[model samples]
Target: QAPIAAYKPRSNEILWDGYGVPHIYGVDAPSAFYGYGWAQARSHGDNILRLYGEARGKGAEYWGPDYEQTTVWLLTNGVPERAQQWYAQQSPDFRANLDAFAAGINAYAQQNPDDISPEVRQVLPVSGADVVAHAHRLMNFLLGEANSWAVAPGKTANGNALLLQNPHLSWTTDYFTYYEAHLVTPDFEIYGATQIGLPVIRFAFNQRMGITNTVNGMVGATNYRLTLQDGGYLYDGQVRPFERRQASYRLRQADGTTVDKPLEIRSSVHGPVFERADGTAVAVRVAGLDRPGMLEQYFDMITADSFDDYEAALARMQVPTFNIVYADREGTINYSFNGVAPKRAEGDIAFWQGLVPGDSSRYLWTETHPLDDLPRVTNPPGGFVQNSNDPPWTPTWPVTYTPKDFPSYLAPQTPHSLRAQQSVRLMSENDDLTLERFMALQLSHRAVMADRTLPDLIPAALIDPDPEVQAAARLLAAWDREFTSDSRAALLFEEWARLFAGQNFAGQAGFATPWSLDKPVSTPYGVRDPKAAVDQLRTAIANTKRKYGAIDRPFGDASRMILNDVNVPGAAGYGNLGSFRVFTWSDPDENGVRTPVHGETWVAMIEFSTPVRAYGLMSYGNSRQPGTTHYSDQIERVSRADFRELLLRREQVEAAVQERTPFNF
Candidate 1:
């Protein structure tokens, strides 16, 4: 008998959608994933393979010796062993899909053999384990889990439940952005805006429910400085020798020869140990390293049929940590400080805030709170739920969830972002949110922080008695506070806030971001430090004038949206301005105006109508290739927050589809 290829699940076709979206039509999950994998590799083979190499701790070999740190991190945390464990533990059905995804990648590589480098070819037919490895890297290293106290947070609200899922990301590399797609299978139809090489949807909505995330403020793990002696660490009052190993990183010299760079990696029972120059060491005991099952959890999330099913998936508690918000057609909307956080003692929270001692056994965390144990708000009276990386306690106003109800390990009360305040203001002001209303609010122009901040800032400027400072403050005060491209005051505020408010209302007193249960979103009110704020405004005014020759220069003029030589300088908002338009820009080009480059990667306003009405936008387009039409296709539309109708039905997808191909094993 001949061997049957594991990926031969069903027939599927890939539609190269005209708007730069990719579609994989299959009868089942496995085949659709297969085509999705094939499409991803074909579009971003170099980058995807590069990510896999880094994930597998082979980055130093694949790229250069600088990535020894990559190998060090992965190897220190037992990533290699964890990968094998997670792969072995997956459901057979998921295993089949993963195999199919890997097959699709190899098939694509074979079709474009020239695209594959010899070093990359060594890891051909990337396994399901590779996907899990990628997830671990993203969650642990790139997700702002390093040296940060807060998880990204914010949200919006309307009477019928509205979500403004705006996650700000700097897409310096192709991996930072998401690939837009709608994958339809008979058993489950998942529409996820995913990363380039993912085999499953990380964030998405089905006909029944939808999910989104803001970084959560849970103390999942912390870095610990170990007491080292004779290249070993002190544990439980004993000197335990460090597990040391040497790995070689190969780099290509200018002479086309490979140079071997030997790297020393050390590990302790706690995890990977980093030796300091002053003869000290530190190790981070991360939970995700213990259970590399996030990909499995994500698959469960996308395939879930209802809110219950989704919660069941989250209960797996395999993912490290994130604030998850969900809404369903059944009128269920909620937020979960979702992650398997270490169940620590009451007073232990502050200890893990930074580098705690590695000598004590109590410092070691083993058990995690189940997904249900974390702070959660379901169907609050407010009729809306959102997270802008703020603490999970305040999902959306009316402030029902209390800190005392949940463990301190769940999510610390991190200060909210201006964007979060803007979202709540718009959602709170509106009612019975139509899809159109949600869309308009998603592209909202209002700056709630301005109202909270400008009061003190203006008074402070006036007190300076510097007429120029008074003029600048009045100019900012006269601002309509809209985010439209022509709003001149918006630019002044952006410049001023970047220099002034970010330093806490010019180092004033009342701006310590005090939480207010009365008005949850506006709690972090400003403090009026007249002398300091006055001095700050003088610099802002002079800077604006020196750069634009006018303090009231158009906002877009200083913060233009730039792409491939296209610059629109009147309407971008820095994240500080409380506008989820969430636009940040490039280095100034002699005029001190930055070109729009990052922030507001993808936006989706999903309403749970029978079939799910979702309006989506990808600011820099779907494909990262410069020559492709998708390179920057959505920027203009994003500036206006315009979204085309989602292609849900088969006929709808086929009508606008420009190219289609079938894959069969």
Candidate 2:
């Protein structure tokens, strides 16, 4: 029998929702997925393809070296050729999907050359292979694993082994945000978010790993004081309160004469003090800064839809720092450590104090953690699983899964961040978790960590800390840990955290002395002393009362960071990071105000079984075109912590196919 002609898509009748999300129908999964990919590319091909080229390190060749430093780096690095080599070795099945995606983009571009940018069009008549190549490039950027070859320590012979994929990309881009779709074929099935212009899901649930989200790789630095062995050294003391500054000072050699050159230092003062042999101190900075290793991993993973395919693709991964929390269809939970963990040594407290001599980086050592040694939690007993930007230790069973005390080189520095601590407390509170409860937990806007942090400061405030403060603390301490927006104590604690922003708390009613256990303690409000904490709380309360005419104004009322005329009240609560929405603390609002810039950008929950069931949510709508309703459609769902069930099976997907069309580039 003659093979059925490949499906062809026509945009004539496809209706875009009010939000501009397209609804297409098709007879089969690949065709439907093709239509979806085509529509996405048609709406955002130029921007997407250009980014792909830049990400692959070919932007300079196409656009010019001066356009972006990153692009220049890629071109110099020979990333495109490397990407092509990797693609040639990708699994045949994945290659086929990529081939199909390329076909869709080529057909669309052919039909609408005018729509494609001159830069992209000239580079075209692009092919499905070209689209697939671009996808690989963008994936490498997101996974950040490609940089292992360039910067990862050790010999090239060994080849950087681990891959931790985490791309710190903004929630929305100029042309697209994130798109969600299920690509199903008789032989393969997958579901997740794909950027416009690209054919396959950039990141999503894997049957092997229960959850997958972008990671920033591993923590490479921490707060440490550096001390100069030689005296008469002058350096930039702590740059600003709660901020690290470059220290410039001269070190005196043993010879009574001062060294002429000044040493430049910038160290985090939040954690432990690191010291070097030169008596200089420095703090740890997380790795993957401007690194593209993660993106490489992302490309490889997407190309390999199955776990086995993914593993094969990882052969090309060089450097990565991510914790993959996964539960397979068989209910096996696995945590993969993908970054280098640094070595940390406990230095004398006095040594730290003397090194800083006023909070300067005079005495510090740069430390690193090896990839094979990072933390991982596999198969905890509870069968339930979750992660909220905390390290791996908190999510797994405590007894069965204590964090391995590998050398500082193995684990670097691990601490229970406020978010991690809160997540653990909530997970332990209930043995039975319903989907709604799980969703609620993910949507929680309460600042549990803030509550714990507040108690540490309340005593420093001399005036009797408000009963509400005490009550909030007490409630937080005694209650089951959860972050639902309606949690009363959470609402109060969020307000209290805001109230203390930028104020010093010392000599207060509850706290008689100032404490700086970890580097000199500083809060958004100011130092945590009893007096300072109390004063800040008082000021915050007064401000709220003045504006809303009530001290008890809802947390949402006071914590908004408005943008684009969209009144995004409370967008900064809990998930916005840090204490409030200010420079560097909050993400830029690339879309509308209601369109959150950051805050749980992606959420994925997976259960490993015969037929894996996965649920996920993205902050922005699926389409990248701001003009399209799908661009920001997911924003409301994200804000509300709602989710849409994803249909991954061929049968299910075929039933849901809205429309299908095929074109040749």
Candidate 3:
């Protein structure tokens, strides 16, 4: 039998939906995973292979020096060796499923050479270990967080739970790219998306429950300030010798040749060491190295039938960090500050966020805080839980968990983003949320920053002596404070805010009233210096007119949505600018067009009805393959803030199917 045939379970089928999503039905878990792997290869073969090569610390050989640092990080961090251990440690059943997933990728590449890129062909015939290695590096090192909201069933119009899985991630094709799929078997059924190349879904919902994640502000890695002495670092009042390791790489040359390069990697008690000027070094230790069952935990999360099962999955704590928002058909809602945070002996979370003293083992934390010890809020009376990459302290409005309740090193008590405040404000202001209302809230383009600070700003700007400042203030006054495609005022406000507030507008020093925990959403309103505010407004008006051809240029015309063949007016603005509908843009090109570089990747709104109802959009489309129309198929819908109703049932899948492939052995 062929190697691919070994992976083929009793029977399996993949239905490619009209929206370029794959609905895979299989006889068993391995069979479904096989289909998952094959679908990923069909869409993102080059990307998956390229990432896997880099995870193996061979991207420099496969691609070029641009990935040299990636290889170095992987080699120094022990990802490759740990990946092997992880693959070996997989449960007997999951291990077979992993192998089957790999076989499916191999089978697809072997049969469809034309579909796979020639440049990435050398990395084909990948194994289960390669799958583990890729995920290990991506989740542990390369990956990092966004916004989530979970409304309890009691708060819904029909008394059914609602969940919004809106994770703001980069639009790049590396680890940030997402693959949407639906998997069905006799034992379990799930619908959602995950990073490209992984077998399990990271963000998904089943009939009984659903989960969404926002990047939790957890300290997963820490840099130690080492005291260097005699080619080593001082540890515990004694000089410790650096553990030396040799690595070799094949460097890709500009002349289409390869050169062998040798690397000398050094480590202390901490995982990896980076040298500094003046004979000093900083040793970095990242968490989640000991936990190899992260993928299994994710698999268990999707397969869970109840909140109990979901909590059991969370108990493993293998997957390092993300604030998980959950809702279930049982009318339960939960927010978990989930991850493996290091258990330090002494110091607050802020102290751990900075460099630790390397000379003492007292600061070194070998263990992690268990699931019970972490902060969590379940079934809050406020009726909602939300996170916008802020700390775990404010997932709900009433504030369920406080800093004193848990270890201070768990998470920082950072001020919330205006986007986060928007998340809480929208939920608090509205009651009895229906599905339509939830969808509208998900696509909200109201700039929270403008609403919060504009009243104070306009009054000050109108009083300015400069004519441009006065004119700009008048324009802002007439503005509706939204970031729709044709909004002229939104652009002027954004520019003025950038000038006045800098990168972080909400927590800036310019605010007359600093952000107080007493007034989380309402404070930080007025400008401290009215004269300086008007001065910045003058500069903003001049800059906007110069860069965008006119001060009144439409926001869409200035900031565009550019995919393969689609170029249109972009919707939404920066999340930091306080739009719940987040979009990060590129610097203006020579054509004065700015495209989205990050923010708002895979967004899924799930309502737990009898048959689970879901609406979703993969903003960058599904396939990264060359010449495939799918590369830009969904950009138009995303630009308009539209979503396709997810086809979950077999009849729905069959009716919407554009293509199908069957495997039987």
Best by TM-score: 3
Residue 340, model 3: lDDT of 87
Number of clashing pairs per prediction, in order: 15, 105, 2
Which numbered prediction scores highest in lDDT against the true structure? 3
Give candidate 3's TM-score.
Answer: 0.96
Q: If the candidates were sorted by their TM-score against the true structure, best first, what order would they fall in? A: 3, 1, 2
Q: How displaced is residue 2 in candidate 2, in Å?
A: 34
What TM-score does prediction 1 earn? Answer: 0.90
Q: For candidate 2, which ten residues in a row score worst on lDDT?
A: 144-153
Question: Could you give candidate 1's per-residue lDDT for residues 1-665 as a string of tens digits?
Answer: 12112122145788777777877878787788888888887666767887887888777666665666767667656565576677887778878888888888988898878866565676676888887677666776563210011111122233233444566666666567677777766666777677777887766776666777767655766788898776577889898998788765565554546677676767777777776788667887776555656777887886676778888888888777777777765667777777768777755456567788888887787787876677787777666666666555556567776878876656555455666666566655666557776676566556666777787788767767678777777788888877776776765666576565554322224464554655666667775454665676677777766766677766666676656655544354555556666666564666767765567776777666555566777777777643667766777776555687776666667798998878874
Evaluated at residue 53, the lDDT of candidate 1 is: 77
Estimate TM-scores for all models.
0.90, 0.60, 0.96
> Best to worst by lDDT, what's the order?
3, 1, 2
